[PDB]
Write an enzyme that holds these catalytic residues in place. Structure first.
Site, PDB file in Angstrom:
ATOM      1  N   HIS A  10       0.833  -1.203   0.000  1.00  0.00           N
ATOM      2  CA  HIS A  10       0.000   0.000   0.000  1.00  0.00           C
ATOM      3  C   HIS A  10       0.868   1.253   0.000  1.00  0.00           C
ATOM      4  CE1 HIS A  10       0.757   1.199   4.191  1.00  0.00           C
ATOM      5  NE2 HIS A  10       0.802  -0.098   4.431  1.00  0.00           N
ATOM      6  N   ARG A  61      -5.702   0.404   4.876  1.00  0.00           N
ATOM      7  CA  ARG A  61      -4.858   0.973   3.829  1.00  0.00           C
ATOM      8  C   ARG A  61      -4.501  -0.095   2.793  1.00  0.00           C
ATOM      9  NH1 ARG A  61      -2.447   1.121   8.966  1.00  0.00           N
ATOM     10  NH2 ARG A  61      -0.366   0.194   9.174  1.00  0.00           N
ATOM     11  N   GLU A  88       0.665  -5.049   9.090  1.00  0.00           N
ATOM     12  CA  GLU A  88       1.909  -4.347   9.324  1.00  0.00           C
ATOM     13  C   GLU A  88       2.523  -4.803  10.643  1.00  0.00           C
ATOM     14  OE1 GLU A  88       3.822  -1.541   7.523  1.00  0.00           O
ATOM     15  OE2 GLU A  88       4.884  -3.022   8.803  1.00  0.00           O
ATOM     16  N   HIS A 185       1.541  -5.059   3.301  1.00  0.00           N
ATOM     17  CA  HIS A 185       2.384  -4.078   3.964  1.00  0.00           C
ATOM     18  C   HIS A 185       3.848  -4.417   3.737  1.00  0.00           C
ATOM     19  CE1 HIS A 185      -1.298  -2.825   6.221  1.00  0.00           C
ATOM     20  NE2 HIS A 185      -1.570  -4.116   6.085  1.00  0.00           N
TER      21      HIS A 185
END
Ligand SMILES: O=C(O)COc1cc(Cl)ccc1-c1ccc(C(=O)O)c(NS(=O)(=O)c2ccc(-c3ccccc3)cc2)c1
Ligand SMILES: [Cl-]
Lengths: 237, 233
Positions: A10, A61, A88, A185
């Site tokens: 992202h 995200r 993440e 991520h």
């Protein structure tokens, strides 16, 4: 090659703009990160890419990056699997601090240790942390055992909880012949790259994956990359 | 008291909701996106929470679901897409407006098609501009030859949808998962017919509104315990 795998990291979040550590905090994309996702989708579209299944995290995200891509390549009807194991890195106590507060509070040496170490986690997010409940008590993690919900993660930790998902859920799908798209991520994707390429902890620490750019692997039947990872886009980017 | 929520997408591009959009993959219009947006705001203001969403493979419904989940901050929810929640397949009429349908088939046949539960419209033939667009679409390439419709009566649509309900939505509801379903008029109609045990003439009477959460309260056996309800002003 036998298989093709596409990864995308992202782009810029609302919180990158504020210089704040997100980790498991569920920041949305900035407008600019949304546009990166659009450009990446357009690159997949121009190259005629087709997928059969999509994996992503439970963070918006990454999820929105995926949506934007599926829209661009007119494949919004694809099955999509979301998992916290693609989240993440959990930055623990640093969550919500910005660059300045962090350098001021901990000093250059300690920050260098955190950025350069593979198994040194940052301080745990304690129950008095402003985001303790926002993250640790988000019902989307209700199904996690006591020890799977982290308080902080080294890179090793993030890769340790991501690779099980790769081996048990995606690999079977690749070997089935399914064309896989992973929208996630930098650090869980780092885990996947480290496994794919058999990189050293040192090498993987050196590696930063470009955001919003489709990352193509041509893999053989044993998921061994037949050549270095490639990117899709215009001659510039 | 189980809670079940249904939402029907709104206006699609180029007036296709008034042109038997059917299995043609029309996108929401801006207006129809706004409709989904209000539906999502209403679901948020009432603090609704889901644990799993079902939708079709048609983008107007998928986008309605995306937009709701955005507005209610539940984009992390598991989503299942199935062609069995697809809109009714209107065969050769797909893409035609009312007038053109009347010109090509006669008021008599058109009224019969309106009022009939088990009479399909004419098949969509290979000369139809949407024929390969729909029937050769990768998303259906796992259907058997007998599953991929070339037209559908209302009965056909409901028949193809109810197996997914029975085998996939009901088990989630029984385990207590709060289910949200974003689909189309006639697939939602099949679900409502099964819930409320309605008659053919009744379901052909029933007209679900668009862009507006429809709420059911079910019991241990999944029978409604009150008329459906609508979220808004
Ligand atoms: O893997 C990841 O997620 C990224 O790495 C990290 C992992 C964890 Cl857990 C935490 C933080 C990082 C991180 C965070 C911030 C920076 C940054 O830009 O501030 C950075 N870059 S730095 O070169 O190492 C650096 C250089 C100089 C100083 C300095 C301090 C005091 C006074 C003067 C200078 C501080 C840091 C790395
Ligand atoms: Cl989705």
């Amino acid at each position: 090659a036998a298989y093709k795998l596409v990864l995308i990291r992202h782009g810029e979040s609302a919180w990158n703009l504020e210089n704040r550590f997100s980790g498991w905090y569920d920041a949305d994309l900035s407008p600019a990160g949304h546009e990166e996702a659009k450009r990446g989708g357009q690159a997949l579209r121009d190259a005629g890419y087709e997928f059969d299944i999509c994996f992503t995290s439970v963070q918006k995200r990454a999820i929105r990056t995926l949506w934007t891509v599926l829209d661009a390549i007119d494949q919004m009807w694809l099955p999509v699997v979301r998992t916290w194991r693609l989240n993440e890195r959990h930055y623990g106590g640093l969550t919500g601090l910005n660059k300045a507060e962090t350098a001021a509070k901990h000093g250059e040496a300690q920050v260098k240790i955190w950025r350069r170490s593979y198994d040194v986690p940052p301080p745990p997010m304690e129950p008095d942390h402003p985001f303790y409940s926002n993250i640790s008590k988000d019902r989307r993690y209700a199904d996690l055992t006591e020890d799977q919900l982290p308080s902080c993660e080294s890179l090793k930790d993030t890769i340790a909880r991501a690779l099980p998902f790769w081996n048990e859920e995606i690999v079977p799908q690749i070997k089935e012949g399914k064309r896989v798209l992973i929208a996630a991520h930098g650090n869980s994707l780092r885990g996947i790259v480290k496994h794919l390429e058999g990189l050293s902890e040192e090498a993987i620490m050196e590696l930063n994956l470009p955001t919003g750019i489709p990352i193509v692997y041509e893999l053989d039947k044993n998921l061994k990359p037949i050549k270095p990872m490639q990117f899709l886009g215009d001659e510039e980017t």
